[PDB]
Amino acid sequence: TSAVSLSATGFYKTPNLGYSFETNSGNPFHYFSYGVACSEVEIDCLTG
Amino acid sequence: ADELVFFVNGKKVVEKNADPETTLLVYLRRKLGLCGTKLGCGEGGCGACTVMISKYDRLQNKIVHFSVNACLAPICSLHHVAVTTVEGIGNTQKLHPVQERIARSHGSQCGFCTPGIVMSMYTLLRNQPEPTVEEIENAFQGNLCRCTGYRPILQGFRTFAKDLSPSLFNPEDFKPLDPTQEPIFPPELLRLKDTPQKKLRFEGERVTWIQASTMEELLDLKAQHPDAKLVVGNTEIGIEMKFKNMLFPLIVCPAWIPELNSVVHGPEGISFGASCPLSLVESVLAEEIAKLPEQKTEVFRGVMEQLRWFAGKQVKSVASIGGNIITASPISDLNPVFMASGAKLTLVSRGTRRTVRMDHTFFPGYRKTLLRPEEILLSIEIPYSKEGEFFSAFKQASRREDDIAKVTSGMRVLFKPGTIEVQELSLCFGGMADRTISALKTTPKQLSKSWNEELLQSVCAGLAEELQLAPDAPGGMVEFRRTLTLSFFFKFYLTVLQKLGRADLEDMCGKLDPTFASATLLFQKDPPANVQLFQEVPKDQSEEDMVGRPLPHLAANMQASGEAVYCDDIPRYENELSLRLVTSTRAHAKITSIDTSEAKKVPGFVCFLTAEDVPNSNATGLFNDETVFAKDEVTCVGHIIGAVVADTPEHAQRAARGVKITYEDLPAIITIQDAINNNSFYGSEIKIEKGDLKKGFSEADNVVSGELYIGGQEHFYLETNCTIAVPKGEAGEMELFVSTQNTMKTQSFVAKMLGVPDNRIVVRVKRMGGGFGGKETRSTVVSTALALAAHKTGRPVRCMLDRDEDMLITGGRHPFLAKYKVGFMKTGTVVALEVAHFSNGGNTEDLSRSIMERALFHMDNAYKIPNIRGTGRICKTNLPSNTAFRGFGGPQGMLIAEYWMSEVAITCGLPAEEVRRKNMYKEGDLTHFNQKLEGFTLPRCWDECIASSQYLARKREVEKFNRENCWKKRGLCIIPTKFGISFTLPFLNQGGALVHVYTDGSVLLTHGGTEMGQGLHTKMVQVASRALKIPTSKIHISETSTNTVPNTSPTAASASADLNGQGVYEACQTILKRLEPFKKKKPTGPWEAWVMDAYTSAVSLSATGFYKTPNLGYSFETNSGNPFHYFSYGVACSEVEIDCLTGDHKNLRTDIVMDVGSSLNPAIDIGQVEGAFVQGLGLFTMEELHYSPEGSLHTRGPSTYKIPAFGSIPIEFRVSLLRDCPNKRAIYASKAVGEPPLFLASSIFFAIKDAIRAARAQHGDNAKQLFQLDSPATPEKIRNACVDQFTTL
Amino acid sequence: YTDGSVLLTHGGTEMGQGLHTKMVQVASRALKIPTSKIHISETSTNTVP
Amino acid sequence: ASGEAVYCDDIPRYENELSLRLVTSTRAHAKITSIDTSEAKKVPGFVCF
Ligand SMILES: Cc1cc2nc3c(=O)[nH]c(=O)nc-3n(C[C@H](O)[C@H](O)[C@H](O)COP(=O)(O)OP(=O)(O)OC[C@H]3O[C@@H](n4cnc5c(N)ncnc54)[C@H](O)[C@@H]3O)c2cc1C
Ligand SMILES: O=c1[nH]c(=O)c2[nH]c(=O)[nH]c2[nH]1
Ligand code: FES
Ligand code: FES
Ligand SMILES: [Ca+2]
Ligand SMILES: [Ca+2]
């Protein structure tokens, strides 16, 4: 009722990327994800 | 189990189970999906459903073409016929010349009436490739348009005929017509012209329809079941079935039978078969009148004169002569002619045949004839006139009830040969009782009498006695009716003197006074002129910059082709339901019980919704004082009690009739006086008060007091209220498609009724087939109900009101009563003014207080008044709630101002234009609400208009006509206007936009405004195009939605171009700053390259925009602060000619000079001046709502509510936009345009009053100077104020 | 909207990975209102290009 | 879990809605020598290929 706008767009671009195959430089990624898994199995050697 | 077989647009249609009740309009829209053809009224008045029919005539061996209203043509009448709709003649890929020309010349605004207008003009061209101008106008008698003011349509189509500033369109560029390129007449139908016609039987849900092929089958069937209802054109049966709930389970249609269609030239007259359409009757009588001698054609010309102003081409093509006779309406225009002239009617039944001369016995009771149940009317013989036999026909200038109280008349006289002495005299009238009647007591007294003054006065006293009307005879207007019986006879009397004189005998009869001759002339409208003037853009302006150029409405082509989608044109979901509202039949009553038992037996019935079914809140309306569905209490005839949901609208309608309500009456408050008596108001008195009232009244040389009543107005948007709610089944989400100006309130009323957050509801508007303020708030009573229904069923639900429902439920412009007292000098200078205003608000507050506020801000109109008091009260009453109507309080206040001003001039004995001009404000003056008037253009508009209308010279010609004419008079007025621009609620002066640019460079722009015919979207594209510096062709607007732009104000107060133009402009500026670096780096490289570089640099190509009108906010406490951002200005001078004997009149000429700043778009702005002007003209002169004493609106369609037609507009109509008047306060220096011109139609009202004054001075006797002319100045009101020897006794 | 309810939309689409849930989570932290006041209804080219 | 979540094919069909089915190659690499549509046209409700 004071005529202020209640709508907005927002926007974002990941900064500082651009890898060169020609020079093998620049960052392809913004960060890396990591993790590790231990798995155990039992096989049946006669049936697969 | 006969198949029904016809063609639509060349394609064969086979219907194996045709239902007799299915109209062509429903079949097209719903079975074939061809939605170009529209529903505007369903009673034949509006023409929006007009299509063409072609068939092979066997009575002519030629292919014929005529137009019909789809809304009244049963598909069962259509076997072996070929239909063409708007989709069949062209589309946007290849427009038909007719479609191109209406579009390019700006004759399509909202677009809703455009296809029916196209089909009328198209049909005309198929029958007359080289029509005359008179023919082009006539083709549209049955076609109504509410937006255009008609001028552009006629102007556009005039290019088919006669076989400073730039222009609005270029006819040089119209594609030529090639008739060889029309669709072929379906070759299949010319083969089937060989097999003789076989009887057909169709069986529907309730009706059986027998299409009889021979007289024998017909009379046979009437012998065995006399109940079988004859249907020929359906132009009356269709009304009885759709509006008066009559059902006729057996119908026979005889239209194929040759003997019912024959035309036979004989000795006494010409016999027409009963099924002959009035269009043929017209055509052969025209041919006969033209080729035979005057003396043989008197009756013929009488018939023709009644056919002149009798429905359009669409109706006459199918309305039978027999049908009119047998319907036996008390207001038939034909039956008095047939009676007076003693036409020979032949009647047959199985084994019988008799002949009767039509006389008083032919009509025994209300809507009855002397036909035996088993008889049919075979034929009617229209007689030649004998030597010394004279005939006239007459009809009441208007129509206010369905069936009664419209005077219409046939008059015949035969002379003893070689004499002036009366052998036969027959005077027959309709609208004076419940049947066509003869003046049988009166006429025999005149036998042998010489045709002279004693005859005249003896016939007048006779008719006054023999046709006396009781003060409460049905249909009212008794004074006016009595006078017309007398006046119509007087015209016949003078006409007869004139005609006696032509046969040499002017020595026996007495010569006619040359000032009387004008009384007898048959209605003639001279050729229309028309000029439009506007400003060219600067020579330097890029040709891609369309701002200030006459660019056509973006959707005009699509509207002219029937491709533009309106709400009910949207395809139905498979599982979609229909809804019909159920409304109170009492003004004020407790509901004691509701019984739905009969509704439940209707097939496809789903449920009946009531207050109990609302999830959260039954409290809605702008001020929260209205119910979704009535609870315990109904408060007006039209109060919504509930809603039937069913599969189809037909089933919803029958099921709704099966809801029985029982009432116990409560004390009702109906009129403004009723509510004054009862202290029944919406809140407290509103007041503006400046200077010193006792001091000004003391100073004053003269003081005048009086009252004025101003009647309301129905918007009559050609598209009625319509909503589709589509439930999404998750989280309460719903999406609605609505014909509304207010998406925000729709959204928020839907959410509150459901108790879900606004964020779940989306409201989408593509366009409305007109709004005018009627869809500012009132559309929501349809929306909420629909939305409820869809929530309960989890199915889509739709409702579109029929005309009757819409006119009844949604309310109108506020009626106003004023009581004024004005004090002034002998010089004309007014010094003191007191006006207390009253409005009728009806049963909810809605916008009523804001409307009164507006009236009060305009009670000055154009004039400085140093000592002034205005008060406003809005009455609360048991009527439908009245609402916004283009003008919004303005035209009512301003008309009151001009009415006391008219009395100022007359009292001072001075010229109105001088008294006006010297009271006018000047630059920098403060209004009564203390707002300073900057950029005051009104004196320029005034001076340009006095000059271009040639007003002072025209005043002299008016004087001259008046001294030389006794029974017609002319009048001339020039009227100014000031109209404040901005919503009276300050915070509503905001708007927003959202723009996207896609990677191909195209732009998708949306804003909070809605398109209702005013070309808003067009202007906004023009704006964005200038602001982005790219062509309009790269920018698109597809719709308005709450989920693209939120919290928008309604499209209203003429401000939407102002508000959204800024919003759009800001969003474009934001896009332009983000593009700048790509522009600099690549300064010539096209727009698309900048957009793609921005995209692949990850720059955002989406933006909002927003704007608020600065510096606003008036307080009534202090009388300070600006309510308006700026003011619109304009002046209209208008000339009329009134017929003092009937009260009819011609609008001779109107000149408008309008200040629209530097127009954004002169074509649309001229468009808006004319359209608004012509609605004004309706308000003040034509449009009248009539209510029962119990508060039940009775005028619920075009048949009794008369908006301006093609033929009502000023013969010469000039509009100029003011040059060099840029408005720094608004977008690209333009001004709002939508509402300011409506009140300038005032000038016609005051011209009429000027001519009445002249009539009153002519026919005395003494007094009253300062007589009453209330608005609208209908023929009734005009005739009654022309006091003469006929009104007195 | 004027009832205080928020309609939110963004260019990502929901394929079972709980994205709108996360975006409703973010928006509620950013605005400092509960998640019940914020709705995401769909992804569309005519709201985010 | 309740089956009220709307996926694309759950959306109600319009009464005039048509259905489409793709026709695909049965050869890994080939010239199209002809397409004969005669049988397709005999199927009730066929509109076009
Ligand atoms: C927009 C509009 C404007 C109109 N304006 C006027 C006007 O200004 N003045 C005026 O006088 N009328 C007016 N009418 C009425 C019009 O003249 C009649 O509706 C028409 O002539 C009836 O003919 P129909 O073939 O359409 O009759 P239908 O509606 O088909 O039938 C009307 C009645 O006539 C009966 N009937 C038809 N033929 C025979 C037969 N041969 N034998 C026995 N009964 C028969 C039917 O049983 C039925 O009761 C208007 C109608 C419309 C829709
Ligand atoms: O000042 C106005 N407020 C409104 O809400 C409105 N609606 C309208 O049609 N004209 C106006 N004028
Ligand atoms: S819709 Fe048929 S005449 Fe108005
Ligand atoms: S354009 Fe003719 S009714 Fe609106
Ligand atoms: Ca209305
Ligand atoms: Ca009201």
Coordinates of N, CA and C and ligand atoms in Angstrom, one line a residue, chain B residues 25 38-50 69-72 142 144 315 718 1198, ligand 3:
Chain B
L25 N -25.5 -22.5 -33.6 CA -24.4 -21.8 -32.8 C -23.7 -22.8 -31.9
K38 N -19.8 -16.1 -32.5 CA -19.9 -15.9 -31.0 C -21.3 -15.9 -30.5
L39 N -21.5 -16.2 -29.2 CA -22.7 -15.9 -28.4 C -22.5 -14.5 -27.7
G40 N -23.4 -13.6 -28.1 CA -23.5 -12.3 -27.5 C -24.8 -12.0 -26.8
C41 N -25.9 -12.6 -27.2 CA -27.2 -12.4 -26.7 C -28.1 -13.5 -26.8
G42 N -28.1 -14.3 -27.8 CA -29.0 -15.5 -28.0 C -30.5 -15.1 -28.3
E43 N -30.7 -13.8 -28.6 CA -32.1 -13.4 -28.9 C -32.2 -12.7 -30.3
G44 N -31.2 -12.7 -31.1 CA -31.2 -12.1 -32.4 C -30.9 -10.7 -32.5
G45 N -30.5 -10.0 -31.4 CA -30.3 -8.6 -31.4 C -28.9 -8.1 -31.8
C46 N -27.9 -9.0 -31.6 CA -26.6 -8.4 -31.5 C -25.7 -8.8 -32.8
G47 N -26.1 -9.9 -33.4 CA -25.5 -10.3 -34.7 C -24.1 -11.0 -34.5
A48 N -23.6 -11.2 -33.3 CA -22.3 -11.7 -33.1 C -22.3 -13.2 -33.6
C49 N -23.4 -13.8 -33.8 CA -23.5 -15.2 -34.2 C -23.8 -15.3 -35.8
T50 N -23.7 -14.1 -36.4 CA -24.1 -14.1 -37.8 C -23.3 -15.1 -38.7
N69 N -28.8 -15.5 -37.9 CA -28.2 -15.7 -36.5 C -28.1 -17.2 -36.2
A70 N -26.9 -17.6 -36.1 CA -26.6 -19.0 -35.7 C -27.4 -19.3 -34.4
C71 N -27.7 -18.3 -33.6 CA -28.1 -18.6 -32.2 C -29.6 -19.0 -32.2
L72 N -30.3 -18.8 -33.3 CA -31.7 -19.0 -33.4 C -32.1 -20.0 -34.5
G142 N -28.6 -5.5 -37.9 CA -28.7 -6.5 -36.8 C -27.4 -6.8 -36.1
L144 N -24.4 -5.4 -33.5 CA -24.1 -4.4 -32.5 C -22.6 -4.4 -32.2
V315 N -32.2 -11.6 -39.5 CA -33.6 -11.9 -39.0 C -34.6 -12.0 -40.1
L718 N -19.6 -7.1 -25.4 CA -20.3 -8.0 -26.3 C -20.0 -9.4 -25.8
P1198 N -31.0 -7.0 -25.5 CA -31.1 -6.0 -26.6 C -32.5 -5.7 -27.0
Ligands
FES3 S1 -25.9 -14.0 -30.3 FE1 -27.3 -14.4 -32.0 S2 -28.1 -12.4 -32.1 FE2 -26.8 -12.0 -30.4

